[PDB]
Structure formats: C-alpha cells, structure tokens
Amino acid sequence: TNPPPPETSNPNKPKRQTNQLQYLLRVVLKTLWKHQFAWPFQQPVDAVKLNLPDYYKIIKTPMDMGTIKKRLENNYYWNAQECIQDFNTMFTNCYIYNKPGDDIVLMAEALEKLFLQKINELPTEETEIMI
Ligand SMILES: CN(C)C(=O)c1cc2cnc(Nc3ccc(-c4csc5c(=O)cc(N6CCOCC6)oc45)cc3)nc2n1C1CCCC1
C-alpha cells in the first residue's frame, strides 16, 4: 500500500559528478536540511500513517529530500538539472495535492524560496569532476 522508496542507486546507468552537483549536496541541500520546516520533507510520505488514501492516485511521482540526498551521495544524477527537477517535483506535489494556504503548503513555499536563493549562487558552467 506504501510503494517502495524511489530509486537511489542503479548499475549501468549514466552517472558522474560535476561542480554544480557537488554544490547541490554541499551547500544547497545542506542549508535546506537544517531548516525549521524541513522535517516533513526529509523522508517519503507515509500515506497510511497520515491517513491519505488518495495520495498515490493523485501524485504519480513521489519525491523527498531524503531520496535526493541519497541520490546525490550515490552519484545517481547525470547533471545538475536532473537533480533540480527532483526538488521541483517535490515542491509541485505538495502544491498539487493540498489547498493553498494550508500549513504544509506554506512550509514548502518557504523551502522553495530559500532553494531559489541558494541556486542563484550556483557556478555558471557545469564542469565534470572525477569520482
Ligand atoms: C501543529 N502540528 C500538528 C504539528 O506541529 C505537527 C506534528 C506532526 C507530526 N508528524 C508530522 N508528520 C508529517 C510528515 C510528512 C508530512 C507531509 C509531507 S508532504 C505532505 C502533503 O502533501 C500533504 C500532507 N497532509 C497530511 C497532513 O495534512 C494534510 C495534508 O502531509 C505531507 C506531513 C506530516 N507532521 C506534524 N506536524 C506539522 C503538521 C503537518 C506538517 C508538520
């Protein structure tokens, strides 16, 4: 009833490390992880614990910062854009499922606003770093 967590490691997959991806782990996610509103996003949503029957009917691609952190540590992404998409998927799922003004929505918007501030300091070019 609770689907398995999303994939965090996969053999024979396009994988590498870039200066932008390192910045996503060492600076961006590091700042968002220690936010006061971060804990509801540090692990996948437990739909049966929170009594959300129609969650996985609406949300087709669940995503959370715990999964993103593991994917960054395991070098699961091919470039930075693949990781930023996972953040935007996480935010959008909360916007899709919940009414505007709800508590969990306000917390997600605060994280996204901070996320976009830390993203503006990303290096201009994406250069490949050895693993
Ligand atoms: C004032 N209260 C009740 C609190 O301080 C409080 C005590 C809590 C105990 N456990 C949790 N766990 C929790 C863990 C994950 C989520 C979550 C992540 S995405 C997402 C989402 O999209 C929708 C929901 N909902 C379930 C509750 O509200 C209706 C919509 O929850 C989530 C929500 C809650 N939150 C707790 N909270 C807050 C309320 C919800 C988030 C934090």
mmCIF file of C-alpha atoms and ligand atoms in Angstrom:
data_model
loop_
_atom_site.group_PDB
_atom_site.id
_atom_site.type_symbol
_atom_site.label_atom_id
_atom_site.label_comp_id
_atom_site.label_asym_id
_atom_site.label_seq_id
_atom_site.Cartn_x
_atom_site.Cartn_y
_atom_site.Cartn_z
ATOM 1 C CA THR A 1 0.000 0.000 0.000
ATOM 2 C CA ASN A 2 3.013 2.216 0.649
ATOM 3 C CA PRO A 3 5.111 1.912 -2.539
ATOM 4 C CA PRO A 4 8.856 1.284 -2.206
ATOM 5 C CA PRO A 5 11.076 4.363 -1.963
ATOM 6 C CA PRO A 6 12.233 5.818 -5.285
ATOM 7 C CA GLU A 7 15.454 4.565 -6.826
ATOM 8 C CA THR A 8 18.727 5.840 -5.355
ATOM 9 C CA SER A 9 21.337 3.576 -6.998
ATOM 10 C CA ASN A 10 21.382 1.783 -10.341
ATOM 11 C CA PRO A 11 24.188 -0.056 -12.165
ATOM 12 C CA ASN A 12 24.873 0.513 -15.881
ATOM 13 C CA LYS A 13 23.369 3.981 -15.603
ATOM 14 C CA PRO A 14 24.737 7.345 -16.808
ATOM 15 C CA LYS A 15 26.476 8.606 -13.663
ATOM 16 C CA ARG A 16 29.209 11.156 -12.950
ATOM 17 C CA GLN A 17 29.968 14.127 -10.695
ATOM 18 C CA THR A 18 30.025 17.823 -11.566
ATOM 19 C CA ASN A 19 30.906 21.007 -9.708
ATOM 20 C CA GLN A 20 27.234 22.023 -9.800
ATOM 21 C CA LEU A 21 26.068 18.695 -8.367
ATOM 22 C CA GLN A 22 28.652 18.983 -5.579
ATOM 23 C CA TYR A 23 27.261 22.438 -4.814
ATOM 24 C CA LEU A 24 23.761 20.944 -4.692
ATOM 25 C CA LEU A 25 24.844 18.489 -1.994
ATOM 26 C CA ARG A 26 27.392 20.506 -0.009
ATOM 27 C CA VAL A 27 25.617 23.902 0.090
ATOM 28 C CA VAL A 28 22.040 23.786 -1.223
ATOM 29 C CA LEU A 29 20.685 20.621 0.400
ATOM 30 C CA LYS A 30 22.836 21.275 3.475
ATOM 31 C CA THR A 31 21.001 24.568 4.030
ATOM 32 C CA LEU A 32 17.525 23.182 3.299
ATOM 33 C CA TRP A 33 18.052 20.125 5.521
ATOM 34 C CA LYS A 34 18.577 22.229 8.667
ATOM 35 C CA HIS A 35 15.542 24.458 8.068
ATOM 36 C CA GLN A 36 12.812 24.613 10.705
ATOM 37 C CA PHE A 37 10.225 23.405 8.160
ATOM 38 C CA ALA A 38 12.390 20.656 6.665
ATOM 39 C CA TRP A 39 11.433 17.544 8.638
ATOM 40 C CA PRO A 40 8.154 16.696 6.788
ATOM 41 C CA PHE A 41 10.275 16.502 3.608
ATOM 42 C CA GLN A 42 13.277 14.514 4.906
ATOM 43 C CA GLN A 43 11.654 11.130 4.155
ATOM 44 C CA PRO A 44 8.952 9.762 1.830
ATOM 45 C CA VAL A 45 5.332 10.459 2.683
ATOM 46 C CA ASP A 46 3.779 7.740 4.853
ATOM 47 C CA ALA A 47 0.296 7.765 3.335
ATOM 48 C CA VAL A 48 -1.191 5.110 5.627
ATOM 49 C CA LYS A 49 0.214 6.783 8.756
ATOM 50 C CA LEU A 50 -1.142 10.205 7.742
ATOM 51 C CA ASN A 51 -4.478 8.727 6.538
ATOM 52 C CA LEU A 52 -4.158 9.872 2.909
ATOM 53 C CA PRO A 53 -5.959 7.198 0.852
ATOM 54 C CA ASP A 54 -5.925 9.028 -2.500
ATOM 55 C CA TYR A 55 -2.345 10.327 -2.343
ATOM 56 C CA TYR A 56 -0.699 7.910 -4.784
ATOM 57 C CA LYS A 57 -3.739 8.169 -7.064
ATOM 58 C CA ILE A 58 -3.059 11.903 -7.475
ATOM 59 C CA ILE A 59 0.734 12.073 -7.050
ATOM 60 C CA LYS A 60 2.294 9.853 -9.718
ATOM 61 C CA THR A 61 5.959 10.583 -8.880
ATOM 62 C CA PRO A 62 6.643 10.927 -5.145
ATOM 63 C CA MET A 63 9.876 12.623 -4.126
ATOM 64 C CA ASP A 64 11.564 13.753 -0.917
ATOM 65 C CA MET A 65 14.830 15.287 0.251
ATOM 66 C CA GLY A 66 15.982 12.045 1.872
ATOM 67 C CA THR A 67 15.795 10.321 -1.510
ATOM 68 C CA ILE A 68 17.525 13.295 -3.157
ATOM 69 C CA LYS A 69 20.340 13.235 -0.590
ATOM 70 C CA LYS A 70 20.961 9.530 -1.225
ATOM 71 C CA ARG A 71 20.894 10.074 -4.997
ATOM 72 C CA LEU A 72 23.482 12.854 -4.682
ATOM 73 C CA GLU A 73 25.739 10.776 -2.426
ATOM 74 C CA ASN A 74 25.495 7.739 -4.728
ATOM 75 C CA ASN A 75 26.139 9.873 -7.848
ATOM 76 C CA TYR A 76 22.752 8.944 -9.295
ATOM 77 C CA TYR A 77 22.275 12.094 -11.398
ATOM 78 C CA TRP A 78 23.945 12.793 -14.731
ATOM 79 C CA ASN A 79 23.925 16.588 -14.334
ATOM 80 C CA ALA A 80 22.614 19.304 -12.028
ATOM 81 C CA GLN A 81 19.369 19.783 -13.969
ATOM 82 C CA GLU A 82 18.381 16.181 -13.225
ATOM 83 C CA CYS A 83 18.617 16.982 -9.507
ATOM 84 C CA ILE A 84 16.868 20.374 -9.623
ATOM 85 C CA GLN A 85 13.960 18.606 -11.334
ATOM 86 C CA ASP A 86 13.627 16.321 -8.299
ATOM 87 C CA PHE A 87 13.367 19.336 -5.982
ATOM 88 C CA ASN A 88 10.733 20.926 -8.226
ATOM 89 C CA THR A 89 8.840 17.623 -8.366
ATOM 90 C CA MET A 90 8.820 17.505 -4.556
ATOM 91 C CA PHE A 91 7.530 21.082 -4.260
ATOM 92 C CA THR A 92 4.923 20.699 -7.009
ATOM 93 C CA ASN A 93 3.466 17.531 -5.471
ATOM 94 C CA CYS A 94 2.687 19.496 -2.302
ATOM 95 C CA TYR A 95 1.119 22.281 -4.368
ATOM 96 C CA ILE A 96 -0.982 19.834 -6.399
ATOM 97 C CA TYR A 97 -2.374 17.795 -3.519
ATOM 98 C CA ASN A 98 -3.130 20.480 -0.923
ATOM 99 C CA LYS A 99 -5.286 23.586 -0.797
ATOM 100 C CA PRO A 100 -3.454 26.938 -0.995
ATOM 101 C CA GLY A 101 -2.835 28.475 2.406
ATOM 102 C CA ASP A 102 -2.627 25.134 4.210
ATOM 103 C CA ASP A 103 0.173 24.703 6.739
ATOM 104 C CA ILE A 104 2.161 22.144 4.743
ATOM 105 C CA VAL A 105 1.926 24.335 1.629
ATOM 106 C CA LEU A 106 3.321 27.392 3.420
ATOM 107 C CA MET A 107 6.242 25.297 4.675
ATOM 108 C CA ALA A 108 7.009 24.035 1.161
ATOM 109 C CA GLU A 109 6.916 27.543 -0.330
ATOM 110 C CA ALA A 110 9.401 28.727 2.300
ATOM 111 C CA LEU A 111 11.807 25.948 1.317
ATOM 112 C CA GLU A 112 11.401 26.702 -2.396
ATOM 113 C CA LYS A 113 12.037 30.415 -1.846
ATOM 114 C CA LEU A 114 15.254 29.554 0.004
ATOM 115 C CA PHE A 115 16.087 26.924 -2.628
ATOM 116 C CA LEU A 116 15.904 29.512 -5.412
ATOM 117 C CA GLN A 117 18.063 31.945 -3.422
ATOM 118 C CA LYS A 118 20.821 29.356 -2.947
ATOM 119 C CA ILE A 119 20.534 28.295 -6.607
ATOM 120 C CA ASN A 120 21.422 31.798 -7.846
ATOM 121 C CA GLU A 121 24.904 31.237 -6.376
ATOM 122 C CA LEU A 122 25.413 28.105 -8.482
ATOM 123 C CA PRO A 123 28.562 28.152 -10.665
ATOM 124 C CA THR A 124 27.879 29.344 -14.200
ATOM 125 C CA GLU A 125 29.413 26.366 -16.032
ATOM 126 C CA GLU A 126 28.907 22.679 -15.227
ATOM 127 C CA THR A 127 32.326 21.008 -15.339
ATOM 128 C CA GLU A 128 32.937 17.304 -14.803
ATOM 129 C CA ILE A 129 34.667 16.232 -11.577
ATOM 130 C CA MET A 130 36.419 12.897 -11.112
ATOM 131 C CA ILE A 131 34.809 10.400 -8.739
HETATM 132 C C1 LIG B 1 0.750 21.580 14.619
HETATM 133 N N1 LIG B 1 1.185 20.222 14.323
HETATM 134 C C2 LIG B 1 0.110 19.258 14.135
HETATM 135 C C3 LIG B 1 2.476 19.901 14.233
HETATM 136 O O1 LIG B 1 3.348 20.673 14.601
HETATM 137 C C4 LIG B 1 2.864 18.583 13.643
HETATM 138 C C5 LIG B 1 3.014 17.396 14.372
HETATM 139 C C6 LIG B 1 3.388 16.458 13.368
HETATM 140 C C7 LIG B 1 3.674 15.103 13.455
HETATM 141 N N2 LIG B 1 4.006 14.446 12.332
HETATM 142 C C8 LIG B 1 4.065 15.049 11.115
HETATM 143 N N3 LIG B 1 4.418 14.284 10.048
HETATM 144 C C9 LIG B 1 4.275 14.621 8.739
HETATM 145 C C10 LIG B 1 5.162 14.083 7.809
HETATM 146 C C11 LIG B 1 5.051 14.395 6.457
HETATM 147 C C12 LIG B 1 4.036 15.243 6.028
HETATM 148 C C13 LIG B 1 3.874 15.603 4.591
HETATM 149 C C14 LIG B 1 4.919 15.701 3.650
HETATM 150 S S1 LIG B 1 4.283 16.154 2.084
HETATM 151 C C15 LIG B 1 2.681 16.235 2.558
HETATM 152 C C16 LIG B 1 1.459 16.570 1.781
HETATM 153 O O2 LIG B 1 1.495 16.855 0.565
HETATM 154 C C17 LIG B 1 0.254 16.548 2.483
HETATM 155 C C18 LIG B 1 0.215 16.227 3.847
HETATM 156 N N4 LIG B 1 -1.007 16.216 4.532
HETATM 157 C C19 LIG B 1 -1.171 15.337 5.680
HETATM 158 C C20 LIG B 1 -1.379 16.282 6.860
HETATM 159 O O3 LIG B 1 -2.037 17.485 6.456
HETATM 160 C C21 LIG B 1 -2.940 17.288 5.370
HETATM 161 C C22 LIG B 1 -2.110 17.068 4.111
HETATM 162 O O4 LIG B 1 1.350 15.919 4.565
HETATM 163 C C23 LIG B 1 2.538 15.916 3.977
HETATM 164 C C24 LIG B 1 3.149 15.776 6.951
HETATM 165 C C25 LIG B 1 3.259 15.460 8.294
HETATM 166 N N5 LIG B 1 3.800 16.375 10.986
HETATM 167 C C26 LIG B 1 3.454 17.116 12.065
HETATM 168 N N6 LIG B 1 3.132 18.403 12.319
HETATM 169 C C27 LIG B 1 3.036 19.511 11.326
HETATM 170 C C28 LIG B 1 1.684 19.437 10.629
HETATM 171 C C29 LIG B 1 1.922 18.793 9.270
HETATM 172 C C30 LIG B 1 3.390 19.018 8.935
HETATM 173 C C31 LIG B 1 4.095 19.401 10.233
#
